[PDB]
Design a protein around this motif. Structure first.
Motif, PDB file in Angstrom:
ATOM      1  N   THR A   2      66.943 175.979  19.178  1.00 28.39           N
ATOM      2  CA  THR A   2      67.255 175.297  20.433  1.00 28.39           C
ATOM      3  C   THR A   2      68.201 176.158  21.252  1.00 28.39           C
ATOM      4  O   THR A   2      69.364 176.351  20.848  1.00 28.39           O
ATOM      5  N   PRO A   3      67.778 176.678  22.402  1.00 24.70           N
ATOM      6  CA  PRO A   3      68.687 177.525  23.180  1.00 24.70           C
ATOM      7  C   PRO A   3      69.930 176.785  23.610  1.00 24.70           C
ATOM      8  O   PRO A   3      71.006 177.387  23.710  1.00 24.70           O
ATOM      9  N   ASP A   4      69.809 175.482  23.863  1.00 23.47           N
ATOM     10  CA  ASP A   4      70.967 174.693  24.258  1.00 23.47           C
ATOM     11  C   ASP A   4      72.019 174.645  23.157  1.00 23.47           C
ATOM     12  O   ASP A   4      73.194 174.385  23.441  1.00 23.47           O
ATOM     13  N   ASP A   5      71.627 174.889  21.908  1.00 23.25           N
ATOM     14  CA  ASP A   5      72.533 174.734  20.779  1.00 23.25           C
ATOM     15  C   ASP A   5      72.665 175.971  19.908  1.00 23.25           C
ATOM     16  O   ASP A   5      73.736 176.187  19.338  1.00 23.25           O
ATOM     17  N   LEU A   6      71.621 176.788  19.784  1.00 22.36           N
ATOM     18  CA  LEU A   6      71.651 177.891  18.825  1.00 22.36           C
ATOM     19  C   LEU A   6      72.211 179.174  19.434  1.00 22.36           C
ATOM     20  O   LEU A   6      73.223 179.698  18.960  1.00 22.36           O
ATOM     21  N   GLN A   7      71.568 179.692  20.481  1.00 17.98           N
ATOM     22  CA  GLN A   7      72.008 180.962  21.044  1.00 17.98           C
ATOM     23  C   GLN A   7      73.450 180.918  21.523  1.00 17.98           C
ATOM     24  O   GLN A   7      74.116 181.958  21.535  1.00 17.98           O
ATOM     25  N   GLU A   8      73.945 179.745  21.908  1.00 15.54           N
ATOM     26  CA  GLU A   8      75.307 179.638  22.411  1.00 15.54           C
ATOM     27  C   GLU A   8      76.299 180.163  21.381  1.00 15.54           C
ATOM     28  O   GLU A   8      76.157 179.927  20.178  1.00 15.54           O
ATOM     29  N   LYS A   9      77.305 180.889  21.863  1.00 14.88           N
ATOM     30  CA  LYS A   9      78.316 181.441  20.975  1.00 14.88           C
ATOM     31  C   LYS A   9      78.989 180.326  20.186  1.00 14.88           C
ATOM     32  O   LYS A   9      79.436 179.326  20.753  1.00 14.88           O
ATOM     33  N   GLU A  10      79.056 180.507  18.873  1.00 12.60           N
ATOM     34  CA  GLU A  10      79.623 179.520  17.964  1.00 12.60           C
ATOM     35  C   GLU A  10      79.989 180.255  16.678  1.00 12.60           C
ATOM     36  O   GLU A  10      80.120 181.484  16.675  1.00 12.60           O
ATOM     37  N   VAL A  11      80.162 179.510  15.589  1.00 11.40           N
ATOM     38  CA  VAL A  11      80.290 180.149  14.288  1.00 11.40           C
ATOM     39  C   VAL A  11      78.989 180.906  14.066  1.00 11.40           C
ATOM     40  O   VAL A  11      77.926 180.302  13.886  1.00 11.40           O
ATOM     41  N   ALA A  12      79.067 182.233  14.083  1.00 11.43           N
ATOM     42  CA  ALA A  12      77.867 183.051  14.179  1.00 11.43           C
ATOM     43  C   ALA A  12      76.957 182.840  12.978  1.00 11.43           C
ATOM     44  O   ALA A  12      77.413 182.775  11.834  1.00 11.43           O
ATOM     45  N   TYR A  13      75.655 182.727  13.248  1.00 11.86           N
ATOM     46  CA  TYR A  13      74.646 182.756  12.196  1.00 11.86           C
ATOM     47  C   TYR A  13      74.080 184.161  12.021  1.00 11.86           C
ATOM     48  O   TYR A  13      74.229 184.766  10.955  1.00 11.86           O
ATOM     49  N   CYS A  14      73.421 184.691  13.050  1.00 12.36           N
ATOM     50  CA  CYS A  14      73.083 186.110  13.081  1.00 12.36           C
ATOM     51  C   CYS A  14      73.347 186.777  14.423  1.00 12.36           C
ATOM     52  O   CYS A  14      73.529 187.997  14.452  1.00 12.36           O
ATOM     53  N   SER A  15      73.376 186.037  15.529  1.00 14.45           N
ATOM     54  CA  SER A  15      73.658 186.608  16.841  1.00 14.45           C
ATOM     55  C   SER A  15      72.712 187.757  17.174  1.00 14.45           C
ATOM     56  O   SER A  15      73.121 188.752  17.775  1.00 14.45           O
ATOM     57  N   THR A  16      71.444 187.639  16.787  1.00 15.71           N
ATOM     58  CA  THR A  16      70.452 188.678  17.055  1.00 15.71           C
ATOM     59  C   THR A  16      69.116 188.060  17.441  1.00 15.71           C
ATOM     60  O   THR A  16      68.065 188.703  17.351  1.00 15.71           O
ATOM     61  N   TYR A  17      69.137 186.809  17.892  1.00 10.86           N
ATOM     62  CA  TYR A  17      67.904 186.101  18.197  1.00 10.86           C
ATOM     63  C   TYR A  17      67.077 186.872  19.216  1.00 10.86           C
ATOM     64  O   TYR A  17      67.608 187.552  20.095  1.00 10.86           O
ATOM     65  N   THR A  18      65.760 186.758  19.089  1.00  8.02           N
ATOM     66  CA  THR A  18      64.834 187.508  19.923  1.00  8.02           C
ATOM     67  C   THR A  18      63.851 186.629  20.677  1.00  8.02           C
ATOM     68  O   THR A  18      63.334 187.055  21.710  1.00  8.02           O
ATOM     69  N   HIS A  19      63.582 185.421  20.196  1.00  4.10           N
ATOM     70  CA  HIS A  19      62.726 184.473  20.889  1.00  4.10           C
ATOM     71  C   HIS A  19      63.314 183.081  20.737  1.00  4.10           C
ATOM     72  O   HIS A  19      64.102 182.813  19.828  1.00  4.10           O
ATOM     73  N   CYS A  20      62.919 182.192  21.639  1.00  2.51           N
ATOM     74  CA  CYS A  20      63.389 180.818  21.625  1.00  2.51           C
ATOM     75  C   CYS A  20      62.209 179.877  21.801  1.00  2.51           C
ATOM     76  O   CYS A  20      61.272 180.176  22.545  1.00  2.51           O
ATOM     77  N   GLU A  21      62.265 178.741  21.113  1.00  2.00           N
ATOM     78  CA  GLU A  21      61.156 177.801  21.124  1.00  2.00           C
ATOM     79  C   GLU A  21      61.187 176.918  22.364  1.00  2.00           C
ATOM     80  O   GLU A  21      62.242 176.447  22.797  1.00  2.00           O
ATOM     81  N   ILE A  22      60.003 176.681  22.929  1.00  2.00           N
ATOM     82  CA  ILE A  22      59.904 175.792  24.079  1.00  2.00           C
ATOM     83  C   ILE A  22      60.336 174.386  23.689  1.00  2.00           C
ATOM     84  O   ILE A  22      61.183 173.773  24.348  1.00  2.00           O
ATOM     85  N   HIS A  23      59.766 173.857  22.611  1.00  2.00           N
ATOM     86  CA  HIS A  23      60.191 172.572  22.078  1.00  2.00           C
ATOM     87  C   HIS A  23      59.543 172.333  20.717  1.00  2.00           C
ATOM     88  O   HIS A  23      58.328 172.521  20.569  1.00  2.00           O
ATOM     89  N   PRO A  24      60.301 171.900  19.710  1.00  2.52           N
ATOM     90  CA  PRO A  24      59.685 171.659  18.396  1.00  2.52           C
ATOM     91  C   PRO A  24      58.532 170.681  18.436  1.00  2.52           C
ATOM     92  O   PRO A  24      57.571 170.848  17.680  1.00  2.52           O
ATOM     93  N   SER A  25      58.595 169.660  19.288  1.00  2.00           N
ATOM     94  CA  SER A  25      57.498 168.706  19.395  1.00  2.00           C
ATOM     95  C   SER A  25      56.155 169.378  19.620  1.00  2.00           C
ATOM     96  O   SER A  25      55.123 168.715  19.487  1.00  2.00           O
ATOM     97  N   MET A  26      56.137 170.659  19.974  1.00  2.00           N
ATOM     98  CA  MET A  26      54.888 171.353  20.221  1.00  2.00           C
ATOM     99  C   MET A  26      54.168 171.774  18.950  1.00  2.00           C
ATOM    100  O   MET A  26      53.015 172.210  19.027  1.00  2.00           O
ATOM    101  N   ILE A  27      54.806 171.658  17.785  1.00  2.00           N
ATOM    102  CA  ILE A  27      54.109 171.974  16.547  1.00  2.00           C
ATOM    103  C   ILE A  27      53.113 170.886  16.182  1.00  2.00           C
ATOM    104  O   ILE A  27      52.101 171.170  15.535  1.00  2.00           O
ATOM    105  N   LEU A  28      53.364 169.645  16.582  1.00  2.00           N
ATOM    106  CA  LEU A  28      52.444 168.575  16.255  1.00  2.00           C
ATOM    107  C   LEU A  28      51.083 168.841  16.890  1.00  2.00           C
ATOM    108  O   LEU A  28      50.902 169.766  17.686  1.00  2.00           O
ATOM    109  N   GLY A  29      50.113 168.013  16.516  1.00  2.00           N
ATOM    110  CA  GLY A  29      48.747 168.150  16.960  1.00  2.00           C
ATOM    111  C   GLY A  29      48.346 167.073  17.943  1.00  2.00           C
ATOM    112  O   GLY A  29      49.125 166.176  18.284  1.00  2.00           O
ATOM    113  N   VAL A  30      47.101 167.158  18.398  1.00  2.00           N
ATOM    114  CA  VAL A  30      46.634 166.230  19.416  1.00  2.00           C
ATOM    115  C   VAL A  30      46.659 164.794  18.912  1.00  2.00           C
ATOM    116  O   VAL A  30      47.117 163.896  19.622  1.00  2.00           O
TER     117      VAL A  30
END
Ligand SMILES: [Zn+2]
Ligand SMILES: [Zn+2]
Lengths: 96, 147, 34, 139, 117, 41
Positions: free
Chosen positions: B91-119
């Protein structure tokens, strides 16, 4: 950092999985005990489980306290990608 | 990467996987691959600046298109092969933001997790609250609901 | 610039644009077109 | 510990080295270069040593082609037209995706070397195997 | 000890096999394709390391330093160039993952320094 | 564990640390030149 003392009769690896599984199993057990401890005896979940009609004592702890570890072929979820379960994670991480 | 984003000669679809642990790089153009769109991020901040959404929201007047977004090069198609070797920011709103660092090397961001579901299963409300086999049964019943 | 609170509507409008452009049977149509 | 190959329209398991010689690399150094890229890989040279220590008796590309014709669906009665059968096998069926022509022989050899290199890496354990369920390997 | 490569008959660009010499009790790598002989530099002709204790640092390349997926840390600097930032990862090589060994590569370019703590 | 080791199959494969061969025509003098050469000779 390699301070682990491998258990005799098994590899350091399997020792590590055994330790992690032991930790998580203990955590889940304690969590379920604490959860089912307090239900006021009025909850209909408790009514049904106590009567034994439909469900089991483990059934509540999922809904209320925590789901608990999930398994495929009786082990931790494998490294489907290169050493990482899902791309949202970093290579070579063993966090629960 | 840049020339693909600009789709001048490298089409947007075609994918390139650079294996780093082994000295090799592969380019896959053959049909049949499966891929989905994702947000690009260069620095800790994402490339979908507030300006683009402004034009997008005023649709049916600018003729502004998702294809025009692709040309702008903020979002890109990703296949599984490339996905194998690229970190994802949930979540760009929550992950990429500076915080207690996880890896700080992200390269892509998801549009929305709800998009993994099917029709069929996307119609289930609060799937995150139901035991999965029930979700599968509901998704297999939804093909029969008369209407 | 981008705002975490407005990210919800931003992402959803992006998705809306993408679907309104493509549809639900794109790959089917496009393969036959090719 | 040797390495053999299974090819279409072939009823036997031809050794790799004789296939290379039939391709045309009868020398030792050329095949060794095509097999190993980091020439200071003793670990890998000791693995390939047995197979190369098998077909060394054959050293002629024509002899290798005659052997290829031998044990064939339509094997030639003698080297006559058996060499032709082997040649058409090497052209049409041997990795056509890299091309089918006289000039594509070297590229065919290089890619054969690459795949056998991957096999040796797998046996050594440096490179991991593949899981068929990896839709990255499904179209 | 150390491994031994192939002595090569240069002129025909072939390889040589060790054969003994009865007259003087010396080993000679001679060609089978032709007649070409080279003295045997060392008595060790074949060796088999079975413990599989190989210095995986040599196999490890420094080029992996730049990858974004791998983890990054600053705890242990690069020895020669003192650079703080290092990337630590695992073997990914079979029959070697039995032991969790951390391999560090400096993030500073042009040094390509690798080491195990 | 004594009876264990008695029963469980054991093979030189799993016990050898490593191996090699050396052309040493003179038994007294060896490339390794270990103490045991004198004992042998
Ligand atoms: Zn020679
Ligand atoms: Zn450095």
């Amino acid at each position: 950092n390699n301070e682990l003392e491998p258990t005799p009769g098994n590899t350091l690896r399997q020792t590590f999985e055994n330790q992690v599984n032991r930790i998580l199993n203990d955590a889940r057990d304690k969590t379920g005990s604490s959860a089912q401890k307090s239900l006021s005896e009025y909850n209909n979940f408790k009514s049904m489980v106590v009567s034994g009609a439909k469900g089991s004592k483990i059934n509540i702890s999922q809904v209320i306290a925590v789901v608990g570890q999930q398994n495929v072929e009786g082990k931790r979820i494998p490294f489907g990608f290169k050493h990482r379960t899902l791309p949202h994670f970093i290579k070579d991480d063993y966090g629960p | 990467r840049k020339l693909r984003r600009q789709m001048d000669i490298i089409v947007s679809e075609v994918s390139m996987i650079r294996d780093i642990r082994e000295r090799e790089i592969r380019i896959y153009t053959d049909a049949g691959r499966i891929c989905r769109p994702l947000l690009i991020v260069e620095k800790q901040k994402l490339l979908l600046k507030k300006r683009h959404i402004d034009q997008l929201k005023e649709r049916e007047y600018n003729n502004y298109s998702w294809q025009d977004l692709v040309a702008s090069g903020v979002v890109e198609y990703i296949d599984t092969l490339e996905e194998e070797t690229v970190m994802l920011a949930m979540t760009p709103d929550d992950l990429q933001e500076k915080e207690v660092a996880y890896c700080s090397t992200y390269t892509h961001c998801e549009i929305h997790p709800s998009m993994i579901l099917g029709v069929c299963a996307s119609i289930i409300p609060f799937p995150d609250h139901n035991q999965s086999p029930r979700n599968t049964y509901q998704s297999a019943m939804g093909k029969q609901a008369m209407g | 610039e981008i705002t975490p609170d407005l990210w919800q509507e931003a992402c959803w409008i992006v998705i809306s644009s993408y679907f309104d452009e493509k549809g639900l049977v794109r790959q089917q149509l496009d393969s036959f077109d090719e | 510990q040797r390495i053999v190959a299974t090819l279409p329209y072939i009823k036997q398991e031809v050794p790799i080295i004789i296939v290379f010689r039939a391709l045309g690399f009868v020398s030792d150094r050329d095949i060794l270069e095509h097999i190993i890229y980091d020439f200071e890989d003793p670990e890998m040279m000791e693995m390939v040593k047995p197979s190369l220590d098998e077909a060394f008796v054959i050293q002629e590309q024509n002899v290798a082609l005659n052997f290829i014709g031998s044990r064939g669906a339509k094997p030639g009665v003698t080297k006559e037209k058996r060499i032709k059968y082997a040649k058409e096998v090497l052209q049409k069926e041997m990795l056509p995706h890299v091309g089918v022509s006289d000039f594509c022989e070297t590229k065919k050899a290089y890619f054969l070397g690459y795949m056998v290199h991957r096999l040796l890496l797998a046996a050594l354990g440096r490179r991991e195997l593949d899981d068929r369920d990896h839709y990255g390997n499904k179209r | 000890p150390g491994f031994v490569g192939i002595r090569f008959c240069q002129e025909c660009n072939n390889m040589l096999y060790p054969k003994e010499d009865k007259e003087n009790r010396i080993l000679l790598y001679a060609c089978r394709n032709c007649d070409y002989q080279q003295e045997a530099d060392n008595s060790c002709i074949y060796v088999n390391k079975i413990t599989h204790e190989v210095d995986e640092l040599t196999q490890i390349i420094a080029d992996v330093s730049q990858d974004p997926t791998l983890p990054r840390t600053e705890d242990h600097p690069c020895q020669k160039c003192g650079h703080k930032e290092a990337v630590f990862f695992q073997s990914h090589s079979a029959r070697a993952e039995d032991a969790m060994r951390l391999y560090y590569v400096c993030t500073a370019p042009h040094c390509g320094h690798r080491w195990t703590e | 564990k004594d009876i264990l080791c008695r029963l469980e199959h054991t093979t030189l494969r799993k016990v050898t640390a490593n191996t090699a061969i050396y052309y040493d025509p003179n038994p007294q003098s060896t490339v390794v030149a270990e103490d045991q050469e004198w004992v042998n000779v």
